Amino acid sequence: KYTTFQGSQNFRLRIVLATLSGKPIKIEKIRSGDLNPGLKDYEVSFLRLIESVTNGSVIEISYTGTTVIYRPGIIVGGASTHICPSSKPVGYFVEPMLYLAPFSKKKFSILFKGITASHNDAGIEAIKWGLMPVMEKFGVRECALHTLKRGSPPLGGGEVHLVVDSLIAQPITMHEIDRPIISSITGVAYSTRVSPSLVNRMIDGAKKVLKNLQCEVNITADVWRGENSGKSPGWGITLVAQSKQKGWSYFAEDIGDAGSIPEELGEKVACQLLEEISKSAAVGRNQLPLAIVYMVIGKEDIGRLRINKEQIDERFIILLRDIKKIFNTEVFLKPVDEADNEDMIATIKGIGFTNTSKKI
Amino acid sequence: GLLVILGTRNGELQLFDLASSSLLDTIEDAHDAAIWSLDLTSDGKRLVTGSADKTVKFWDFKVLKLHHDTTLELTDDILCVRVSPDDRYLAISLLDNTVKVFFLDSMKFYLSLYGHKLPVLSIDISFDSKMIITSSADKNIKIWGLDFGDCHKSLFAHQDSIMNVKFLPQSHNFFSCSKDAVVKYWDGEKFECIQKLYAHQSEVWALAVATDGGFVVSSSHDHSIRIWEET
Amino acid sequence: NIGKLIYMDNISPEECIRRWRGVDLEKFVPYFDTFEKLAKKWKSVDAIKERFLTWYELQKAKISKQLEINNIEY
RNA sequence: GGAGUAUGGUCGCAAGGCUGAAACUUAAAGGAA
Known about the structure:
The structure is cut from a larger assembly and holds chains A, B and C.
Chain A: E1 3-6, H1 11-21, E2 25-28, H2 41-53, E3 54-55, E4 58-61, E5 68-71, E6 74-75, E7 79-83, H3 91-100, E8 108-114, H4 124-130, H5 132-137, E9 143-149, E10 158-164, E11 175-176, E12 184-192, H6 197-209, E13 216-223, E14 234-242, E15 249-255, H7 262-278, H8 288-296, E16 302-308, H9 314-323, E17 332-335, E18 343-349
Parallel strand pairs in A: 1-2, 7-8, 11-16, 12-13
Antiparallel strand pairs in A: 2-5, 3-6, 4-5, 8-10, 9-10, 12-14, 14-15, 16-18, 17-18
Helix pairs in contact in A: 1-3, 6-7
Chain B: E1 3-5, E2 13-17, E3 26-27, E4 35-40, E5 46-51, E6 55-62, E7 65-67, E8 71-73, E9 81-83, E10 89-93, E11 99-103, E12 111-112, E13 120-125, E14 131-136, E15 140-145, E16 151-156, E17 162-164, E18 173-178, E19 183-187, E20 193-197, E21 207-209, E22 216-219, E23 225-228
Antiparallel strand pairs in B: 1-2, 2-3, 4-5, 5-6, 6-7, 6-8, 9-10, 10-11, 11-12, 13-14, 14-15, 15-16, 17-18, 18-19, 19-20, 21-22, 22-23
Chain C: H1 3-6, H2 13-21, H3 35-41, H4 55-71
Chain B binds one RNA strand through strand 15 and strand 16.
PDB class: ribosome
Keywords: Ribosome assembly, ribosome
Entry title: The complete structure of the small subunit processome
């Protein structure tokens, strides 16, 4: 109740950074200018998720629903099943827990049930290939994310299974001052309850764009059928460029629309891949808040990360103004010496962070 | 203007006008082989014709004469082509077990269908473009959902082979006509045989539905036109 | 500098980039442009073509090299 | 050193539900009975 944040912006981020710090926060004036003011249903549902993994946390909601009090407890975890509400997909809930994964008292074996994709939030292949390889660079080795049943809007009925077994004391101090050289472009193109000829026609949109590029273009066609293909039909593609040298991955994704052209969507995401790569340096714009945090909660040491100014938006600063209000860590930014590009090195002294909860 | 448009096994598209004598204008050599389909848009300025020449040609109702905008080069023996009453979707049956639904404005090949084992003899879609019905000679009706290109339910009926199916413009309730001399009435939501007609006893070749009233017009092989008024 | 323009709180992040050139985090996919604007931009890949193609003292060197990389940084 | 047995380890192999089976219970036909 001592750190106060205004507004519902980056709400699941602010619960994370209070939980790792152990500094109590109070987020007031959440959506106060609405005809239905206060929290949404899923933001309440997400607060049930933090309670299930942390014993001792106290969560208080005022009766106008706009003021949320959270004194964090320690990360216990264990194995449980969270029900995801049908407003937001399961990827709205997998993404905060990877910040909490390597530090729990026990193994995270968390079962998610609900819709498994949307326009905004991360698909399953966005996490299995975009976020988990960022995890391994910081020293989270035995980390995984299994798919049991795949869902799709509007009914979903899909299931993923987050399993994290590496329980490390801190993320290691990363030094990446080199733009990684892309070796191959991989990808996953999935579809549920619909014609299997879409997926090859999705890839034909993707291989049409990339024929001027000389790197390997391989998209694993993942055609789902049967009971483990979820209730409602739909499809999507996720494309991943990779670097053979250090394992850095860049990605972009989208799903199918109510009446979309599968030739266009296979062409669109490959454009959104190369647009993301053109703004990138050693991360993506959607992988950067996972790595900014891991330099902060890494041990008491200077890390380095070569990032680009195109990544630096209004959204990136609000990330660095949520850290300074919690961890009080200035992120020093120095220019690189390469005169062809405007890369900057993000250097962070990590706050000295441990595992409170792990037994010895 | 009470204007009438017809198609032949000759590759030609001749029209009939009721206030005048029989012929005003004839297209000749529209195709080489037999045409099999003819669909009307909401306006009427363009018709779509499907032929055994592996070609689909649009025909421009110039004011009153006909010319073509584009031709469609295909690979199969085209049987029925239908345009959406929402003027968005243009479905095409082929010789293969395939239905290709095209976008109206730029012909982008929106959709393809599989798994039917016999060629499609008539295609319907709804007033609001939600359900596709592609009845074929493989003794069944496969009701395709138009949103995502999947089916909702397949339906074995009409012992011999199913020639013509048309809809009701009010709701998802449709008819079925076939060579085994039975006309049936169905739900697009319950998917059940509501009312089953036996009356005219030879092969049912044709079917048409009143656009507001609901009387049912069927044809036989043995020369009977039956009109089914709805009580 | 960008950093002393960041860590002030009187500046809006809209103004921060306008000071640097001269959005909610809840959605995961960052803001792109339209596929109309991107497909015409990404006809050629020639802009992005630059990016393609004892145990003890060893482990003690993991500390010693980690020391003076603080020092040249500070 | 060979023979033999056991083997909660590591790696590979495999299963069942008539096929036809498209997501839908779906034809012609075949298989078994």
